Symmetry: C3
Subunit: 427 residues, 3 copies
Amino acid sequence: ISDARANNAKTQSQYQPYKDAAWGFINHWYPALFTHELEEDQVQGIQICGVPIVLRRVNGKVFALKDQCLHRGVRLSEKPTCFTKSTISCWYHGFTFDLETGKLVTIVANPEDKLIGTTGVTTYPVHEVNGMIFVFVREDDFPDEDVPPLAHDLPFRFPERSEQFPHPLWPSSPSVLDDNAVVHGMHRTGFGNWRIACENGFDNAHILVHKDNTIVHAMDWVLPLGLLPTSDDCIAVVEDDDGPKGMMQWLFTDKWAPVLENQELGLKVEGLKGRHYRTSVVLPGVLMVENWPEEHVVQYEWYVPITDDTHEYWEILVRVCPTDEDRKKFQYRYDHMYKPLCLHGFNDSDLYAREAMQNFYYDGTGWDDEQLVATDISPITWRKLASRWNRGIAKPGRGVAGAVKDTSLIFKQTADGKRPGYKVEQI
Amino acid sequence: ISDARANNAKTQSQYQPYKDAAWGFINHWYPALFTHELEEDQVQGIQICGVPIVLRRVNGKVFALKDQCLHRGVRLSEKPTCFTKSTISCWYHGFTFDLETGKLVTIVANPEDKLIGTTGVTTYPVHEVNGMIFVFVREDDFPDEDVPPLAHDLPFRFPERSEQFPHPLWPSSPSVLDDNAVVHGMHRTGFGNWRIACENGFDNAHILVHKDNTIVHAMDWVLPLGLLPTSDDCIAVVEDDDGPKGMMQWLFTDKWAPVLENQELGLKVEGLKGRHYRTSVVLPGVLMVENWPEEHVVQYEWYVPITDDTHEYWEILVRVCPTDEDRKKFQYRYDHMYKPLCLHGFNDSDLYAREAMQNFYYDGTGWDDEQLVATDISPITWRKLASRWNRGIAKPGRGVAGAVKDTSLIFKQTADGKRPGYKVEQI
Amino acid sequence: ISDARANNAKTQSQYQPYKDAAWGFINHWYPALFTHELEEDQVQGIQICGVPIVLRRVNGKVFALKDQCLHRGVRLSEKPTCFTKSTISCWYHGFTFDLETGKLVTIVANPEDKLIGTTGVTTYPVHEVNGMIFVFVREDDFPDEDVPPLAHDLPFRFPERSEQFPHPLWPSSPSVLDDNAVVHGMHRTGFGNWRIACENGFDNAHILVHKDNTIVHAMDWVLPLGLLPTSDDCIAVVEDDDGPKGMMQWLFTDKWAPVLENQELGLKVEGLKGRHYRTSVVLPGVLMVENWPEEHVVQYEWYVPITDDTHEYWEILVRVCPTDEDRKKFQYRYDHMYKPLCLHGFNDSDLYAREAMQNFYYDGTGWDDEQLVATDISPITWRKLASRWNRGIAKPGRGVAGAVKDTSLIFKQTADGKRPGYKVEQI
Ligand code: FES
Ligand code: FES
Ligand code: FES
Ligand SMILES: [Fe+3]
Ligand SMILES: [Fe+3]
Ligand SMILES: [Fe+3]
């Protein structure tokens, strides 16, 4: 280990909380499911930051509760059983909970037991908007009154912040919160810790990973060997109380210069061609790529922790569609252009890159022995701000799926060919 | 956690030994194989309470020894090798053991080695009766003279105990020990700890689990929302010396009342239709369902621990058949009625219920945080009596299969599509 | 455990280092790949003694470096990326290393970073000869000047040592180091620890394992129930500096008598038929079987540790072939005789024997509780010399594949049907 690395002892001590958050940052908003994944009266189970969650849509409204019966720990979502519009019951003995408050309102097989009403399961605030269902995954004792607005855990908004983050080279990127904003995309279970996936999301220099992508050649692009910071303020950190906590990278400005050659290897690029775009990231780990893949379109990504070694990788493209014609045009171009060539053709390569790093980090080795460099100012800055502003560090799961990794149930599923997942399989 | 739960600190302290019995209660009788699974000269390896056992039938008699060669720990059952009617040899170097005493009688490759006769492998008492082969799984040092009759670890017998446990609504259930008693059934490896499976076996209140079963609708049954104990003595605990240790539930008496409605959810059942039956459980964890599925027929179940997270679930139906005409009728009705509609159609639902509870309990959480209620007086009473009368708590396996859960051998098998099992694969 | 076993406390204390070497003996020469597995410009990743290694052939010469990028730990071999004839680059951010010295010569994405040249990856000496690519797997700090000749880690040579180890019943066995020596064979990943496999390699008494082999009956052989040492100098131990460290077993001499009967079991062999052969083993665990399967042909095996519970089992046959005709005869007889009837037909049985032993030993039980006998003077002698002359005990892997055994990555691969392996999958 060289003393010339960027991550010296002092620096590493500045992001200890981040090193400690393998299970994720709790008390934050996370995308749970696309709207189309939960129709009226549908019930679905998932897991975020190690917390088992079950959601149900009733009268058009989505509710979320901990997917764990108080009686004997059964997952309510495995066999959806609801007797009324305001409740959900456990399919084993009938412990029943109120969707709104999570209170144990009754027990099917024992309506007069003294336990009824004296406790209940945890509730998680929900915010559904433009095809996205967000859930505020919080600790059991996080007060309702303390729940912040969804916008605080979503990327910076434009043109609201165009003045703060000037972008003369491209039109304003829409937000999932914008009126008539349309979302198209997917989320796939990723194998490995969420942190490693997230940092890959906004890495500025990994051309080798995408050099062979079809889109790069179809568009006749000529990528740079890399991008390096020219000054200390190449990244702007935002920490105000009313707004998202993250960093904005001044791409396509003077603060970031493209590398066109490597004298040692005899490499040299000329006539660079490409796209104008800009990446930024905010807590709990949300990427925004302005002007990608095309003008007026934007890409957002999440790397939602499920357990400490699996995450749900979200990729969505957003575009405001005023008319019905606009929606059809966006849907069509997504289906035969963006989805195959970008969300897949471009980003699938990132998957192998992320998995390739996991072994160095899981047992803790990489978090100490990695040898970061000048370009790593990006991830380092992110780790520091994340350590300073996260609303909590999730505790390891206990008495839930993922608490123990080598159970006979997991071997049974693996023998059956089932990979680690996200959505709970129903009976 | 609510103070209104039935399992308060005082109560939990009364079943600490049961919380400690993950690997099972040792020094007890368990079903090993059906007679048809071991023909003359056949050898078969299994695992119970973490103890590897190999069985062989010679001259009609079955013998059981520890499936572990003293030399270098190879499982003798993997490649059945026997040179005489009274021995079994290890297929590697030929260490040979006496079927009766387990003594090392010779070594094929070294007939004059000083080790010969100075040691041997553990022997396990066998008691085969009416198609069932029971083995007394004991610790290496449990004295032969202390081995109790098989009856002591088998459910209460009738009419012998008809006076003690009156049953005016149905005829006496036969025992597998009875003359002309015929056994039909099966055993399947269950994924999860044995205790969780056993408790489900005699659970009185779980209609939601069997409400959709085909047999319930074919018979025009109308099940109750649940059964409630009306008095303190709703269960009779038997603790005599000469006999089985367990509890008899006074079903279909005024001590247990059905629940026909739930005012909170607006549920109500009318026109009560079903079957008369009674359940009881005795150590090491054997269920008896009198008058099921029909008169003169009885269902018995075992949840034999294999490791601490797998068990072998036995389901058998017994009926005394004097003539071979009776045997053909029973065999026929089993094949086209009891098996598909009951052992499978009814009980398969219990399998999903058991697996769903396992994650809450394996790491210890559930045994402390479960919130039991009034109806849980059944399992609690069983846990207490089991803690008081078990003949021993099995220790974790060491130097045997299951001792380590994530070996490269287990991953090889899993990769090949093989689920965790019970019967040792040969060659 | 009997006091009559050969491995008493005193004896066991003489091979504690061997008990401690689950991950293998490091700072030794091991077979890495066959020449045909690495063509010009081909890159391949492997793992030995827990050390990830990447090899590449440039201008006919093979180089070996640690398969771990020092930036963020990705395996360089997953996506072979080389810009010049003297380097290899990480496919993520372009950290580039010199094949010869392993020094970090540059970073494609940052040519002027201060980290450049201040560090690098470990290099491993390579010795390619007669179709075999050997690599000296060493600790990071093992000095270049201390790297010994490949011969020191290869079996004893003949006729060079014919006087020291007289062999009047057969002609001299060739070495892979001999001019015109031709190698034919294979290596397969084994599931279990390397020590267990190695000891089976030179075991003299396991007729039951090979009795049914086709070659035994096709050749009308009549094997002995076993072989016994008649004197305590039945094995010669060689320990001087200039040469291999190991032992020679005086097979087919007065020191090893065959066992033809077992009075206890009524076994008795007559007219024993077979062939003359001789086994010896040297560090790091290399078997030599002289005069097998035929005169002028010799079998060599290696049990290369990959992790502490997997190894790469090598089986090769060597014969000096002066002319092109000789090579065609050898290639032909290998393909339709040696490979199917010997390397497979005979040794495949050894695979099941090895796997069957692993469970007793992995958690440490067998290394203490195994009950060895007179014939075990063979493996005991090996354990002792190995403990005394090994050049190092490999440390468990940290931050590399195999460091953690139950990652979601491993469950993903297993779910997809992939068994634990050796050669790193590319892309
Ligand atoms: S486990 Fe849910 S009601 Fe019993
Ligand atoms: S391992 Fe059984 S005789 Fe050697
Ligand atoms: S991980 Fe190898 S250059 Fe970054
Ligand atoms: Fe990328
Ligand atoms: Fe049931
Ligand atoms: Fe062999």
